[PDB]
Amino acid sequence: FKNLREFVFKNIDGYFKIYSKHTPINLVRDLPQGFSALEPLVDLPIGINITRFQTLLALHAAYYVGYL
Amino acid sequence: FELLHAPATVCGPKKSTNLVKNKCVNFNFNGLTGTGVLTESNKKFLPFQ
Numbered sequence: 360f361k362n363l364r365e366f367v368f369k370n371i372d373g374y375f376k377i378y379s380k381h382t383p384i385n386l387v388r389d390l391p392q393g394f395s396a397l398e399p400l401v402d403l404p405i406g407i408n409i410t411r412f413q414t415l416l417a418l419h420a421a422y423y424v425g426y427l
Numbered sequence: 428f429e430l431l432h433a434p435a436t437v438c439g440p441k442k443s444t445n446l447v448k449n450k451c452v453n454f455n456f457n458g459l460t461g462t463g464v465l466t467e468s469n470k471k472f473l474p475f476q
């Protein structure tokens with residue numbers, strides 16, 4: 360899977376903030392080293408309190424989870 | 428008019444008074460305030476900058 364979908368999710372001051380970047384890769388079982396900053400961002404002025412995370416996945420796959 | 432801690436979204440459009448160059452005028456913008464000289468520059472701005 361050459362496609363890497365790197366996202367960042369954050370809630371500050373009552374808005375949901377997102378980041379994204381699509382970049383080709385070579386390894387799928389581990390994240391390769393390298394630098395590529397995530398310029399895109401969209402602000403969602405919702406005000407929703409969020410403390411729990413559930414991955415929404417389509418069922419008729421692997422992913423990583425980090426913490427800031 | 429409901430305002431939240433998040434950045435506001437329902438804004439009010441103005442008249443973006445015509446712009447001039449090479450003379451000291453107020454350069455007040457959507458987020459900037461002050462006076463100065465506005466010339467033409469060829470910086471490589473990013474789409475989100």
Ligand SMILES: *[C@@H]1O[C@H](CO)[C@@H](O)[C@H](O)[C@H]1NC(C)=O
Nearest residue numbers: 372373374406407408409432
């Ligand atoms: C919910 O978010 C607001 C600001 O968005 C904050 O003031 C409040 O403490 C939060 N409450 C909880 C339970 O996270």
